């Protein structure tokens, strides 16, 4: 198995844009449609580590901790190096779910 039930970076999760989420939004750097994530601090979208690693780059240059997968709606913390699930993430996950499915 399960994600962590809490992490010390949940405090950095910011309010969801009224625009909502677009789970088909491409990577802001390379334009790939594959394995994208959305940053739960600034809501920029960048690709996963198995494509071009742009979300990892975003974490490195911003320090933003938590990102949500447009594949499976899991949330990853780059500081804790673990998946995290908590009530503080349910609204953003559900918005993504509604857009995706
Ligand atoms: O891709 C990112 O930038 C962050 C998420 C993530 N981090 C990793 C770090 C080291 C090894 C494998 C990883 N695999 C990762 O995500 C895999 C994945 C892909 C799709 C849905 C859920 N999880
Ligand atoms: Zn990319
Ligand atoms: Zn960010
Ligand atoms: Zn964390």
From Swiss-Prot:
Residues annotated to bind Zn(2+) 2? 27, 30, 47, 54
Q: What are the boundaries of the UBP-type zinc fingers?
A: 5-101
Report residues binding Zn(2+) 3. Answer: 39, 42, 58, 64
- Locations listed in the record: Cytoplasm; Cytoplasm, Cytoskeleton; Nucleus; Perikaryon
Q: What's noted about post-translational modification?
A: Phosphorylated by AURKA; phosphorylation increases HDAC6-mediated deacetylation of alpha-tubulin and subsequent disassembly of cilia.
**Residues annotated as binding Zn(2+) 1:** 7, 9, 77, 80
Name the segments for region: Ubiquitin binding.
48-50, 76-83
Which domain of life does the UniProt lineage start with?
A: Eukaryota
Q: What induces it?
A: (Microbial infection) Up-regulated by the presence of SARS-CoV-2 N protein during viral infection. The SARS-CoV-2 N protein enhances HDAC6 stability during infection by reducing its proteasomal degradation, leading to elevated HDAC6 levels.
| Functional note | Deacetylates a wide range of non-histone substrates. Plays a central role in microtubule-dependent cell motility by mediating deacetylation of tubulin. Required for cilia disassembly via deacetylation of alpha-tubulin. Alpha-tubulin deacetylation results in destabilization of dynamic microtubules. Promotes deacetylation of CTTN, leading to actin polymerization, promotion of autophagosome-lysosome fusion and completion of autophagy. Deacetylates SQSTM1. Deacetylates peroxiredoxins PRDX1 and PRDX2, decreasing their reducing activity.
What is recorded about the protein's domains?
Histone deacetylase domain 1 mediates the E3 ubiquitin-protein ligase activity. The primate-specific SE14 repeat region contains seven SE14 repeats with the consensus sequence X-L-X-Q-T-X-S-E-X-A-X-G-G-A and mediates binding to valine.
What do we know about how this protein assembles, alone or with others?
Forms a trimeric complex in the nucleus consisting of BANP, HDAC6 and KHDRBS1/SAM68; HDAC6 keeps KHDRBS1 in a deacetylated state which inhibits the inclusion of CD44 alternate exons. The complex is disrupted by MAPK1/MAPK3-mediated phosphorylation of BANP which results in BANP export to the cytoplasm. This facilitates acetylation of KHDRBS1 and CD44 variant exon inclusion. Interacts with SIRT2 (via both phosphorylated, unphosphorylated, active or inactive forms); the interaction is necessary for the complex to interact with alpha-tubulin. (Microbial infection) Interacts with G3BP1; the interaction increases during SARS-CoV-2 infection, promoting the association of G3BP1 with the viral N protein which disrupts stress granule formation and facilitates viral replication.
Q: Which family does it belong to?
A: Belongs to the histone deacetylase family. HD type 2 subfamily.
The disorder on record is: Chondrodysplasia with platyspondyly, distinctive brachydactyly, hydrocephaly, and microphthalmia: A disease characterized by chondrodysplasia, severe platyspondyly, hydrocephaly, and facial features with microphthalmia. Bone abnormalities include a distinctive metaphyseal cupping of the metacarpals, metatarsals, and phalanges. Affected females show a milder phenotype with small stature, sometimes associated with body asymmetry and mild intellectual disability.
Q: What is this protein called?
A: Protein deacetylase HDAC6
Instruction: Give from-to of the shown chain within the full protein.
Output: 1109 to 1207 of 1215
């Amino acid at each position: 198995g399960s994600p962590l039930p809490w992490c010390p970076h949940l405090v950095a999760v910011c309010p969801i844009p009224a625009a909502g989420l677009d789970v088909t939004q491409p990577c802001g750097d390379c334009g790939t449609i594959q394995e994208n994530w959305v940053c739960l601090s600034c809501y920029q979208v960048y690709c996963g580590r198995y494509i071009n690693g742009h979300m990892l780059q975003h974490h490195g240059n911003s320090g933003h901790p938590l990102v949500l997968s447009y594949i499976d709606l899991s949330a990853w913390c780059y500081y804790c190096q673990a998946y995290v699930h908590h009530q503080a993430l349910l609204d953003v996950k559900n918005i993504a779910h509604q857009n995706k499915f």
